[PDB]
Write a protein that binds this ligand. Sequence first.
Ligand SMILES: CSCC/C(=N\C=C1\C(COP(=O)(O)O)=CNC(C)=C1O)C(=O)O
Ligand SMILES: CSCC/C(=N\C=C1\C(COP(=O)(O)O)=CNC(C)=C1O)C(=O)O
Ligand SMILES: *Cc1c(COP(=O)(O)O)cnc(C)c1O
Ligand SMILES: *Cc1c(COP(=O)(O)O)cnc(C)c1O
Ligand SMILES: [K+]
Ligand SMILES: [K+]
Ligand SMILES: [K+]
Ligand SMILES: [K+]
Lengths: 456, 456, 456, 456
Amino acid sequence: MNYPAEPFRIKSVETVSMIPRDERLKKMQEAGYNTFLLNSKDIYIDLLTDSGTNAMSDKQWAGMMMGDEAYAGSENFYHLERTVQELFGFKHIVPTHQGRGAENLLSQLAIKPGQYVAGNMYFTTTRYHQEKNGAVFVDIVRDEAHDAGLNIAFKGDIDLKKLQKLIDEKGAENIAYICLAVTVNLAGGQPVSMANMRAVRELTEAHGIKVFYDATRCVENAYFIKEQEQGFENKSIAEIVHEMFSYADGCTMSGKKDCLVNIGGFLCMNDDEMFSSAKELVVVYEGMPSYGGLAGRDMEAMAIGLREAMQYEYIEHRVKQVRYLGDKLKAAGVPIVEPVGGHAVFLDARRFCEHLTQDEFPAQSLAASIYVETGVRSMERGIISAGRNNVTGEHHRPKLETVRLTIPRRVYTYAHMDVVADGIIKLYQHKEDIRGLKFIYEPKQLRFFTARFDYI
Amino acid sequence: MNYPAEPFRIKSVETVSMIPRDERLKKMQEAGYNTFLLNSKDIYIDLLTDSGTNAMSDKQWAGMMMGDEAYAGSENFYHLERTVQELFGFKHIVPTHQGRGAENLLSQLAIKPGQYVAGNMYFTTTRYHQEKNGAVFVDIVRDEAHDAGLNIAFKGDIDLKKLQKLIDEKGAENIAYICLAVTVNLAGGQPVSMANMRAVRELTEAHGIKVFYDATRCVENAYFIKEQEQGFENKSIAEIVHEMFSYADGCTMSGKKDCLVNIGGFLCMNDDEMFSSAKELVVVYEGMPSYGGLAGRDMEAMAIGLREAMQYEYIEHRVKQVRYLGDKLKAAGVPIVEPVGGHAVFLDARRFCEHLTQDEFPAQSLAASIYVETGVRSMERGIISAGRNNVTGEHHRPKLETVRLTIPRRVYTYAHMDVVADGIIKLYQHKEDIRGLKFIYEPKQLRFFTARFDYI
Amino acid sequence: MNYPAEPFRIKSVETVSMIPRDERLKKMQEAGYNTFLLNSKDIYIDLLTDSGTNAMSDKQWAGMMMGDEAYAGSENFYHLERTVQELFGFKHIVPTHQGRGAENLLSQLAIKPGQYVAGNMYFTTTRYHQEKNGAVFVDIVRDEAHDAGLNIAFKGDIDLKKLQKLIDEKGAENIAYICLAVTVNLAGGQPVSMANMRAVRELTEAHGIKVFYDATRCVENAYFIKEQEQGFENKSIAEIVHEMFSYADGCTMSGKKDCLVNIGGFLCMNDDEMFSSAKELVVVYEGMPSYGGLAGRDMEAMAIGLREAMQYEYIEHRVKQVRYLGDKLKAAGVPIVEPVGGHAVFLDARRFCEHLTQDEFPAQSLAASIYVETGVRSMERGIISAGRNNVTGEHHRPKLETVRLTIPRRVYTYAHMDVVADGIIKLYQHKEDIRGLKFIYEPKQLRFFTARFDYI
Amino acid sequence: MNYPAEPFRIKSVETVSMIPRDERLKKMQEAGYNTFLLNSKDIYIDLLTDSGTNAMSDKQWAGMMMGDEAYAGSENFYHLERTVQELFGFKHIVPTHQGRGAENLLSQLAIKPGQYVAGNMYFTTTRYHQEKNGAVFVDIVRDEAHDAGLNIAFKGDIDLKKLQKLIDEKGAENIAYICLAVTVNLAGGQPVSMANMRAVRELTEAHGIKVFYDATRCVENAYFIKEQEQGFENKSIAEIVHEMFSYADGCTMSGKKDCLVNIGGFLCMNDDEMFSSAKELVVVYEGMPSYGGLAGRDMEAMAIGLREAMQYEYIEHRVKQVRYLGDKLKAAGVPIVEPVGGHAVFLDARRFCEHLTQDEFPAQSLAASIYVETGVRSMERGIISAGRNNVTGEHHRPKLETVRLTIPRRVYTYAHMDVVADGIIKLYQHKEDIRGLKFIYEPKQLRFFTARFDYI
Ligand SMILES: CSCC/C(=N\C=C1\C(COP(=O)(O)O)=CNC(C)=C1O)C(=O)O
Ligand SMILES: CSCC/C(=N\C=C1\C(COP(=O)(O)O)=CNC(C)=C1O)C(=O)O
Ligand SMILES: *Cc1c(COP(=O)(O)O)cnc(C)c1O
Ligand SMILES: *Cc1c(COP(=O)(O)O)cnc(C)c1O
Ligand SMILES: [K+]
Ligand SMILES: [K+]
Ligand SMILES: [K+]
Ligand SMILES: [K+]
């Protein structure tokens, strides 16, 4: 059934400014046409990211009042611990303040310099921590994942042949681990099949290679398996999640995504020796094995939220709400990355703004247009975010020139989705009018965060 | 716009679910076929009432943490007091735990036995407190308000000819006060025009008759004035509200409606001696005049909520979401009260259940049947709620035999409206299947709350 | 063991102004030397009342986030219902917004005009509702209770001989009920023995007379039985509470006292017919049998708080903290009502300010002195609160001319108790310097609430 | 006053309890005789640490409901930023999830391998991040700070002669920065004088050496300046704090101490290029510069808490409550570090356990023994926390072998202090009963957190 009603009601609301177009235009200009510079208080619908922006439940808020704030041995940690062991089925769990804290720990524990880490594409923080610790990254995703127009299921799947080739050519001893991400963010949030997770587990296990999941959107992933993978029709979301992780040696998790919280993450593993070493390192960067840089109340909220995420109707609606936005855009001819993923819709700004060269920052400009026309903030994921080559001074020119409409969980309705869609569709119907942008201030680093622009 | 999106985001959620038809069926019998008697857990979308069921905002919840719980001199009481003085324009305020607490005070303060109270249609608790204190209720609303299907604006208006007649026939001295309600709940949430409020004030003042408003849905009422009364189109909701009350001597208010809270009300008046006497009486029934049977944190929430209610986009969306439900029902040919009111859609039980006489309680029955087929809870607003005539002993017989789909503020989405509209439509297909009801337990007053029936 | 440490720690604090003596003096003067007129924000330690001023737990605050706000059938009501049935052992419970709401219902249900209601002294609201409904009040407390200097246990006990005398002289048919209060507020919060409750139950039952408790401080009462009544040494607080109520036909309860909440109360009874009638009346004044003028979250908080009140260490500390203040004052020779009761210490201002006549308002003036010297607000319970005879224009001259230091539960520490004690002791050491007060503004009614004074 | 009462009221509470001696005994063995390894549920009064264990205020909890959870541009980040700029006077702020997150950034940003970092005594995580990044730690605190029993003011002061010597012997170019901590935790919470901060700034500035403060207990430190440094007696806490930081180039802060929160920290600096580089690095480890691994609601709580910390009566009471505990212990002859510091009383493990050598870990053992006899949890602050010398491999041997009774802010009362003091005193009676400990598990760094021992 295409678009279910919200399987929840509103307990409480977040106050927003409903400032009109003329005032939004002034805010956009004061932000140098960079949506990253906009004030939260000036935004109606904020689709910058689905990270940490989720609406919690009444049950989680009750948990928020029961924070056992002890430095060691907090009841909230034990709740988190037993929840994650039950639901993910790992032996050991170390909390971290969010996903990149867990990635820091994992890559220091699991990588010898010179070794390879192979994955289904990559995410920036994850790959950074791998490389920082001496790894060489190797993309082993299926070639299809790089074709953003290709409508196929389980587009996040690892190519077993590529994995085999890496094993044959570099040797198993020289592969630190396989980093299998669910879903695959860089491909537009594409799911990985259970068949693929099993095949990868089976090949790596034969060579004694470890597999660690980047589990950030593992619940959206489980919903795709439920919906589209033959034989998972009688399985609960919890059963699918538990089976997914049975094919890994551990994971890095951002609770800020699929655990329905505003902060929080953790590291899981099965190996006792690695657990011991991880506990030795968490104290350096995060905090105790029993708080890991989180307040007691946040371990509690994340424990409760991960269990809420198992509800079929919740995750079905989460994914289908994103789908609604994608479908509506596609029906109007708006160019998007296909198929639509679990967490976001990516506009193809290259095609949307065909009259503009990449050097005129079509994605950055389209994101500015969207905020002005609708009060919606979206994220530039194109040439600006790619940054400038420091050696040569040339832009990094990504194949993907996109605007990301990233959907927080349980925050918005289908009517908000219409606001976004109708506005983008209206812009599309006169897309030729969207003006190119030029730098007026460009920092040396992290340019996407603070750069300012004006129209050409 | 016809149907604007929610002018807020979801801050927190609570889970909703439906129990099977057969468990609901047992449940409906268990509750004597009275919807009021089902359990919250057993209801899927709860449209029993917009009273006390509202979603509060983040700001209200911040105020909830700032409860100054002192018996006298609470910062929260000061903030409520100054908010109501600013927004309604009355000299004095006495908080009460809810609206009927205020009606109890007003009726004891302002009625000599044998006097008449004239109002624009009755309300259940209001009339009961009028009658308990020895008043005769006279209905002075226009005839058109009693005609369900008749689509005319400002149906809540007092017929000035009827008021004049009451003055000529009884004498001004025998009229305790005019009870002017905004909106008029039992006519279908129908608004009163500013022109009418001004006319009523002018006529009553000339004769020395006091006017007390039932302020309960005054913001919804102000929305209709802004939308439909010529010359108000560029006035703010707040200006409109402030002008409305300028035509009154005081008011009763259930804050559980338009003040966006879960508990709370108050009594306002301009008269100093009435204020003194009211403080004497409040102590007996409610609490000290400095809290009136409310926690400090609730006086705070109500102060905050009443000001939030003045936001144009909030009340526009509130009223239009109700209108959406009505539009869908009406497009499919489901009989409703017209025009759609501020807070609810009222299915016209007489037309829905042509095959029944009003004596067979079609509304109470329909309410029951909707629960059985859909798990949506709705309320009886016809012959049962009307009560017994305290002179003859016969049922009062309102022309309006209606079943209320009552919308809490900021709780539901258009998708929930769509779920409701689909189920109602389906039930309509087999309307002849709805059976007459008979009393098995009748309470001696306000019988609709806890009466039990059995099928005829 | 004399004074135990707090059997809890501070989860959160309430911000206070620490304004110095000179600024307190200006606030006192702006309040016309009437502590009832002081702003909460200007008070360091507020001992005006133990009603509704309690600090809730983390567990109760979690309950506050789980308010099921449904108009009927709320999960919170069922929680409250089962808690009260378990702990108090009554068959039926109707929630009310606080104690006087329950008293309203009880007196309307249980009294025929002309009938007598006999009790161990009285409280103002309780006795008012009895008389409003046609009852004649008869004090049947032991004569000792009226001797405020007499240090004896179970000073709240009813004199069985007085009860017998009333039965013999007026006839059982003409006694509406016995109103047995635990503790007895007017006597300084004096406990009633289990022996007394049983004797009263046994006598009334033989004559078919009903007994309803005014149960407001029934848990403090149970602690005295535990501490001082032979044979209750192996009994839990819960066992004692449950046995107490086994000697009654029902009760009126203010949760705002011993249920550790800021708002809330309820009516209990065993009789089915009375329960039915009570449900018919609660809708008139309070709300539904399943909310009774409370938000869902408050029924939840009160359910949780009543169960917390059963913890031995909590109630032992509550009562012994009050005792600490009393003991400390008595050791310094400060005149107090004896023995110290469960909830408050009463200063004898007649003796404290011997140089002043009652017409110079010694209690009112002493309460003003206390606030000025310490930042502590206390309540005048003397000639000002007694009011003026409207017939004659003379003061009502009470035998008790007192200042009440009323202790909210779990809000203050022994260090706050020292602030209060040290300041009063310092004032006592030069008590001759305390000046008489004269009216400068006196309202006709409720004079204690708003009257203003100046020094003679 | 010696011991002022709490300058706040209790808003909410959490229950405390003690489990029997024999269950505690099993528990202490279960945790390898390391206090860090017991469970919060099993501790009666938890004095393990003042880090993250503070009670928040009603205002902070109101801010907690107002979490603006946006990835960038959150109102909460803006409020934190402007609060720290106003109160500390630094140009730039980068939030971090807690203090060691900030130390990680500072150490990576400001140290070239082979450089020296000189500080007023070491701290565990600080030294580890210094050393990890290739710095040699040089202790430049006065000798007197290493002498536990020596009662002198401003023990935290840097010995300027030692700083001068470091500059002459190594050269200014080889000193990365001076790490000046306020207060000095491991000397016993000992304050640094303004005179010393000014002297240090003057000497370092002349040589072009940067100074970065560990701001963690800066408010406690400001209290000691106000109380004891001539000429500061009429300065506000805020003026003092602002002046302190005027002598620094930046700071690291764990907000979990003096900012009155349960999570949170930040890095401040004046230098624009260091700020740019820090924003680059924060993204890797913590989060975007606009949240730094914190929920918006926590940036809010920390902004609010830091301003609350400036209230004179709050910090006076905070420090004096610690002092009370120390005074009681000292009056009974229990050996402690003197003078008593801002946040904790440190029992002098060397004198408490004369019969043990430092190699037999007297502090770790005493910590264990106190838990067994009292159920009060305390922390090791001696040879175990000092760690291994990263050149020789031997334990570092601090003269200060101490056991910390660490007081969370606004959680406990003087009665709790009395309970602690009684139990410690009793244990002192039989001090010879405390047995040597030996390692059974030693972590490779920050070993004290999770090391396990067995008795010798
Ligand atoms: C009595 S039925 C349940 C409560 C209900 N209105 C309650 C109203 C009251 C009484 O207010 P309280 O419910 O006591 O706060 C007064 N006037 C008006 C116009 C009302 O609609 C409603 O569902 O519509
Ligand atoms: C590391 S032991 C546990 C945390 C502890 N202090 C932590 C401190 C940190 C690190 O701060 P975080 O714990 O990472 O917020 C820096 N400086 C200073 C002076 C501290 O006392 C304490 O208990 O005292
Ligand atoms: C968001 C994300 C991360 C990092 O988690 P944080 O909690 O943001 O540090 C890692 N991998 C993927 C695929 C992510 O989306
Ligand atoms: C406080 C009190 C009441 C009334 O309860 P409220 O909740 O204040 O209405 C009745 N009896 C006694 C003895 C009380 O103390
Ligand atoms: K967040
Ligand atoms: K409610
Ligand atoms: K209160
Ligand atoms: K904490």
